[PDB]
Amino acid sequence: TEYKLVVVGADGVGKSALTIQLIQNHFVDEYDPTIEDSYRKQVVIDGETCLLDILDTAGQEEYSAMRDQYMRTGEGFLCVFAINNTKSFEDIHHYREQIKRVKDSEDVPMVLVGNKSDLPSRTVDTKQAQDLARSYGIPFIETSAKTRQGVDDAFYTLVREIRKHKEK
Ligand SMILES: C#Cc1c(F)ccc2cc(O)cc(-c3ncc4c(N5C[C@H]6CC[C@@H](C5)N6)nc(OC[C@@]56CCCN5C[C@H](F)C6)nc4c3F)c12
Ligand SMILES: Nc1nc2c(ncn2[C@@H]2O[C@H](COP(=O)(O)OP(=O)(O)O)[C@@H](O)[C@H]2O)c(=O)[nH]1
Ligand SMILES: [Mg+2]
């Protein structure tokens, strides 16, 4: 039923666009980059009604004790980079290690997301992202918030992952 998802990623990669697409089915062209906020979507995934509580983490860099305990209640994570930025791909490792830290676990459900797949300025290879996703034991998804491609499939896969982490 309830699954706390966290869309992590560097400023700009389209975490808020991928949030507002899953929740409202439209491309927002200007969501405040200083606004970090949570959003729930009741969707039915594979027979089971699921209240996905998605946190779009997007503000300033803080690491308070409050924020640890907060991201430790996050059960699953979308590591969101943009195909049109390399720093955004190199930041995916950083996000994964903050998750491994706050979760005290090597085995936390994650899904690599190569956002902005519609732009013709690919700087991050699909092989790279598959290589980075195969080293983590996580699925890799290429998405487009502008065109919703892979959006559902991304968040849905993450919950399928979280489903598989619970039967373990
Ligand atoms: C996330 C998360 C995160 C998790 F998944 C899990 C647990 C966490 C527990 C924390 O206590 C705290 C976090 C946490 N919260 C906010 C961060 C952040 N703010 C700044 C901007 C860019 C995103 C958004 C959010 N707005 N930015 C960067 O890291 C980016 C880089 C780029 C410049 C320097 N830093 C150091 C690294 F090299 C990479 N990390 C952040 C971070 F860990 C956590
Ligand atoms: N073309 C395209 N632009 C995107 C996509 N996702 C986000 N953007 C753009 O990237 C900019 C910043 O994205 P935002 O959602 O603010 O990312 P955040 O700062 O990581 O939350 C926005 O102006 C969006 O128009 C996408 O899939 N395709
Ligand atoms: Mg944002």
Topology:
Blueprint: E1 2-8, H1 15-24, E2 37-45, E3 48-56, H2 65-72, E4 76-82, H3 87-103, E5 110-115, H4 126-135, E6 140-142, H5 151-166
Parallel strand pairs: 1-3, 1-4, 4-5, 5-6
Antiparallel strand pairs: 2-3
The structure holds ligand 6IC, guanosine-5'-diphosphate and magnesium ion.
Summarize the structure.
The protein has 168 residues and is of the alpha/beta class. The chain has helices at residues 15-24, 65-72, 87-103, 126-135, 151-166; strands at residues 2-8, 37-45, 48-56, 76-82, 110-115, 140-142. Bound molecules: the ligand C#Cc1c(F)ccc2cc(O)cc(-c3ncc4c(N5C[C@H]6CC[C@@H](C5)N6)nc(OC[C@@]56CCCN5C[C@H](F)C6)nc4c3F)c12, guanosine-5'-diphosphate (GDP) and magnesium ion.
Could you walk me through the main structural features you see in this protein, from its secondary elements to its overall organization?
The chain is α/β, with parallel strands linked by helices and 168 residues long. The chain has a single domain, classed as Rossmann fold (3-Layer(aba) Sandwich). The chain contains 5 helices and 6 strands. It has a 6-stranded mixed sheet, with helices on both faces. The longest helix has 17 residues. It is globular, with a radius of gyration of 15 Å. The relative contact order is 0.21. The protein binds ligand 6IC, guanosine-5'-diphosphate (GDP) and magnesium ion. Guanosine-5'-diphosphate binds next to helix 1. It is classed as oncoprotein. The entry lists the keywords g12d, gtpase, MicroED.
